[PDB]
Amino acid sequence: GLGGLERFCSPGKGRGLRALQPFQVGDLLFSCPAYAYVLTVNERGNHCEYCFTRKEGLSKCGRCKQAFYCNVECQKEDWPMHKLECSPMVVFGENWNPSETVRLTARILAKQKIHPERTPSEKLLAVKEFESHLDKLDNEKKDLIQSDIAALHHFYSKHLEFPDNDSLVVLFAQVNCNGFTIEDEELSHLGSAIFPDVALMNHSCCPNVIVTYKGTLAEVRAVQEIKPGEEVFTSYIDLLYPTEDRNDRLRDSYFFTCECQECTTKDKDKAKVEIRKLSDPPKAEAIRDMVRYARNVIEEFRRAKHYKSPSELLEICELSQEKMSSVFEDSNVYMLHMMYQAMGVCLYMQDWEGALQYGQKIIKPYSKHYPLYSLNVASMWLKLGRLYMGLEHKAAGEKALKKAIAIMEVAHGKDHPYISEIKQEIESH
Ligand SMILES: O=C(NCCCN1CCCC1)c1ccnc(-c2ccccc2OC2CN(CCc3ccc(Cl)c(Cl)c3)C2)c1
Ligand SMILES: C[S@@+](CC[C@H](N)C(=O)[O-])C[C@H]1O[C@@H](n2cnc3c(N)ncnc32)[C@H](O)[C@@H]1O
Ligand SMILES: [Zn+2]
Ligand SMILES: [Zn+2]
Ligand SMILES: [Zn+2]
């Protein structure tokens, strides 16, 4: 197993992870090497395929020209996984489009053939033991899994010996239930991976640990003091949202309803859905209509970023914030959601002033809605610091970069390469 920890039966939460020793804020509970992992398509050329090192001058695979490495060692070490895609990418050309889940699942199947025995990533929970929720699958989820199985056969039949369709539906369901996205220091999507021992941890909206990544290595650090006998919880979702939203997401993606202290008390729900203090106060039904409108625009924007222009996208943000502002306060999470989306459009357009304009409005409400140590808060401080630095506002930039560092020292560890990069940014300017 893992020193100072153990697997146990968590009542009403299946299997979980329990502490056998005290952990202080910032302590590393454990590390977990990726069992299987894939660099996202949009990050190719920026990060090494094998170790995820972000570097300039990465060497391109000569055959597919769509894999980049630190050197010939990273190239060679990645080949058992890269061969599943190398020749297929040049053969299918523009037609090569498997989903990231399919790309990851192909790598799980390849690893199972090469290394059927328990790996150092499975000291407490094995990939074969993963919870699937197969019995809970509705028509929509079975249809998505069936599309994934067809893409798996379509693009990965060369080296894989597939089990029957029944074993593949269990696998794809296990992957959705236990798979991790890997994000960078700005919470930008890097790729997807399997970390079996990390997937043993259950969810809480007031977690006592945070998961971070050091290349393809997952690290688990305390964000609250943990005592012997206490269960170790991480957050599976974005904690900005009120209780109903959080549980709608946990039910849809993980088939359960959270009963943590935040979900039971609903303490932060009032401030999260803050209403304007108007002379004629807004009616209960008028609030409910705006909450419904707010969730609908969130979904509308999500679809729109796939085909609308940057000005159309910014229009959706501006117009929806205008309609919402008649009922909702600026610190309200639905207002904040649109501002964050608008900041993201600005960043893409390289409209640094516009991105800064939004980030400045988001940061104080983020600090009040998110937990004490939050990757979402650290990432916003970091973006703000980098925008201020880029726009020659070096004192404001240094202050924001040091706010990011203070959180990241707890979550990522004092010695994290991301913190060395931020300190170099402070010292170079
Ligand atoms: O890292 C993530 N969040 C932080 C906590 C992670 N923790 C790991 C262990 C527990 C929680 C995360 C977020 C989103 N996506 C994934 C992800 C990564 C890999 C493969 C599928 C992935 O999930 C995608 C998104 N999604 C939800 C819809 C869904 C749910 C069930 C089924 Cl059976 C089907 Cl068909 C479809 C499919 C991971
Ligand atoms: C990644 S697994 C975590 C380990 C899992 N408990 C097991 O036995 O394999 C995620 C699943 O654990 C369960 N789970 C996690 N957190 C929970 C919670 N707070 N309450 C209830 N069930 C929870 C759900 O069934 C969820 O889909
Ligand atoms: Zn490398
Ligand atoms: Zn190649
Ligand atoms: Zn909760």
UniProtKB/Swiss-Prot annotation:
* Keyword Zinc-finger carried by entry: yes
- Which consequence is recorded for altering H203A? Abolishes methyltransferase activity
Catalytic function, reaction form: L-lysyl(4)-[histone H3] + 3 S-adenosyl-L-methionine = N(6),N(6),N(6)-trimethyl-L-lysyl(4)-[histone H3] + 3 S-adenosyl-L-homocysteine + 3 H(+); L-lysyl-[protein] + S-adenosyl-L-methionine = N(6)-methyl-L-lysyl-[protein] + S-adenosyl-L-homocysteine + H(+)
Q: Name one Pfam family in it.
A: zf-MYND
Resulting phenotype, Y370A: Abolishes methyltransferase activity on p53/TP53
Kindly indicate whether the keyword Repeat belongs to this entry: no
Give its E.C. classification number. 2.1.1.-, 2.1.1.354
Give the protein's function: Protein-lysine N-methyltransferase that methylates both histones and non-histone proteins, including p53/TP53 and RB1. Specifically trimethylates histone H3 'Lys-4' (H3K4me3) in vivo. The activity requires interaction with HSP90alpha. Shows even higher methyltransferase activity on p53/TP53. Monomethylates 'Lys-370' of p53/TP53, leading to decreased DNA-binding activity and subsequent transcriptional regulation activity of p53/TP53. Monomethylates RB1 at 'Lys-860'.
What is the name attached to this protein's record?
N-lysine methyltransferase SMYD2
In which organism is this protein found? Homo sapiens
